[PDB]
């Protein structure tokens, strides 16, 4: 789970 | 030692300290890469934690996922401060925006630490129930 | 070594 909302957070970069 | 969670927590605090003394040496465009780093070492941390979760009391896993969500949030705030420091380079709000960026990353590290304690402490209450 | 880096923050 946790990674998911993070990778999403990451994309915006 | 053989504790991965501990290590990534240390890699990540390292990544935070680098960032600290390297905005000084970097141009606005580069701030993206450094945060990208902090983000990536963080994913490694959050990942190796996500691996432990199965083997331990749900009573922990609540508060643990709490500090995890907390970190994602912490990153987001760091990212936003970074965006603001880019746009505001060459304006009087340049320095303040950078100051904010550092604080965002600072508490990011702090919460990484608290993640560790929550894990160490939950690892224990696990071992003694068993 | 973490406690070391930990204080280096401040």
Swiss-Prot record, chain A:
A motif (LD motif 4) lies at residues 5-13. It comes from Homo sapiens. The modification Phosphoserine is found at residues 1, 12. This is Paxillin. It is found in: Cytoplasm, Cytoskeleton; Cell junction, Focal adhesion; Cytoplasm, Cell cortex. Phosphorylated by MAPK1/ERK2. Phosphorylated on tyrosine residues during integrin-mediated cell adhesion, embryonic development, fibroblast transformation and following stimulation of cells by mitogens. Belongs to the paxillin family. Interacts in vitro with VCL/vinculin as well as to the SH3 domain of SRC and, when tyrosine phosphorylated, to the SH2 domain of CRK. Interacts with GIT1. Interacts with NUDT16L1/SDOS. Interacts with PTK2/FAK1. Interacts with PTK2B/PYK2. Interacts with ASAP2. Interacts with unphosphorylated ITGA4. Interacts with RNF5. Interacts with PDCD10. Interacts with NEK3, the interaction is prolactin-dependent. Interacts with PTK6. Interacts with TGFB1I1. Interacts with SORBS1. Interacts with PARVB. Interacts (via LD motif 4) with PARVA/PARVIN. Interacts (via LD motif 4) with ILK. The chain holds residues 261 to 273 of 591 of the full protein. It comes from the Eukaryota. Cytoskeletal protein involved in actin-membrane attachment at sites of cell adhesion to the extracellular matrix (focal adhesion). Recruits other proteins such as TRIM15 to focal adhesion.
UniProtKB/Swiss-Prot annotation, chain B:
Phosphorylated on tyrosine residues in response to various stimuli that elevate the intracellular calcium concentration; this activation is indirect and may be mediated by production of reactive oxygen species (ROS). Autophosphorylation occurs in trans, i.e. one subunit of the dimeric receptor phosphorylates tyrosine residues on the other subunit. Residues 1-130 are annotated as: Interaction with TGFB1I1. It comes from the Eukaryota. It is found in: Cytoplasm; Cytoplasm, Perinuclear region; Cell membrane; Cell junction, Focal adhesion. The modification Phosphotyrosine is found at residue 6. Residues 1-130 are annotated as: Focal adhesion targeting (FAT). Most abundant in the brain, with highest levels in amygdala and hippocampus. Low levels in kidney (at protein level). Also expressed in spleen and lymphocytes. Disulfide bonds: none annotated. Belongs to the protein kinase superfamily. Tyr protein kinase family. FAK subfamily. Non-receptor protein-tyrosine kinase that regulates reorganization of the actin cytoskeleton, cell polarization, cell migration, adhesion, spreading and bone remodeling. Plays a role in the regulation of the humoral immune response, and is required for normal levels of marginal B-cells in the spleen and normal migration of splenic B-cells. Required for normal macrophage polarization and migration towards sites of inflammation. Regulates cytoskeleton rearrangement and cell spreading in T-cells, and contributes to the regulation of T-cell responses. Promotes bone resorption, and thus PTK2B/PYK2 inhibitors might be used to treat osteoporosis. It is linked to Aberrant PTK2B/PYK2 expression may play a role in cancer cell proliferation, migration and invasion, in tumor formation and metastasis. Elevated PTK2B/PYK2 expression is seen in gliomas, hepatocellular carcinoma, lung cancer and breast cancer. This is Protein-tyrosine kinase 2-beta. It comes from Homo sapiens. The chain holds residues 876 to 1005 of 1009 of the full protein.
Curated annotation (Swiss-Prot), chain C:
A motif (LD motif 4) lies at residues 1-10. It comes from the Eukaryota. It is found in: Cytoplasm, Cytoskeleton; Cell junction, Focal adhesion; Cytoplasm, Cell cortex. Phosphorylated by MAPK1/ERK2. Phosphorylated on tyrosine residues during integrin-mediated cell adhesion, embryonic development, fibroblast transformation and following stimulation of cells by mitogens. The modification Phosphoserine is found at residue 8. Signal peptide: none annotated. Cytoskeletal protein involved in actin-membrane attachment at sites of cell adhesion to the extracellular matrix (focal adhesion). Recruits other proteins such as TRIM15 to focal adhesion. Belongs to the paxillin family. Interacts in vitro with VCL/vinculin as well as to the SH3 domain of SRC and, when tyrosine phosphorylated, to the SH2 domain of CRK. Interacts with GIT1. Interacts with NUDT16L1/SDOS. Interacts with PTK2/FAK1. Interacts with PTK2B/PYK2. Interacts with ASAP2. Interacts with unphosphorylated ITGA4. Interacts with RNF5. Interacts with PDCD10. Interacts with NEK3, the interaction is prolactin-dependent. Interacts with PTK6. Interacts with TGFB1I1. Interacts with SORBS1. Interacts with PARVB. Interacts (via LD motif 4) with PARVA/PARVIN. Interacts (via LD motif 4) with ILK. This is Paxillin. It comes from Homo sapiens. The chain holds residues 265 to 274 of 591 of the full protein.
């Amino acid at each position: 789970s946790a990674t998911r909302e993070l990778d999403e957070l990451m994309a915006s970069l | 030692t053989d504790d991965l969670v501990y290590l990534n927590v240390m890699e990540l605090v390292r990544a935070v300290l680098e960032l600290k003394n390297e905005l000084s040496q970097l141009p606005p465009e580069g701030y993206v890469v450094v945060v990208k780093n902090v983000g990536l070492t963080l994913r490694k941390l959050i990942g190796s934690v996500d691996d432990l979760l199965p083997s331990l009391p749900s009573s922990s896993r609540t508060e643990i996922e709490g500090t995890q969500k907390l970190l994602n949030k912490d990153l987001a705030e760091l990212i936003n401060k970074m965006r603001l420091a880019q746009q505001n380079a060459v304006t009087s709000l340049s320095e303040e925006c950078k100051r904010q960026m550092l604080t965002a990353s600072h508490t990011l590290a702090v919460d990484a630490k608290n993640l560790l304690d929550a894990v160490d402490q939950a690892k224990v209450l696990a071992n003694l129930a068993h």
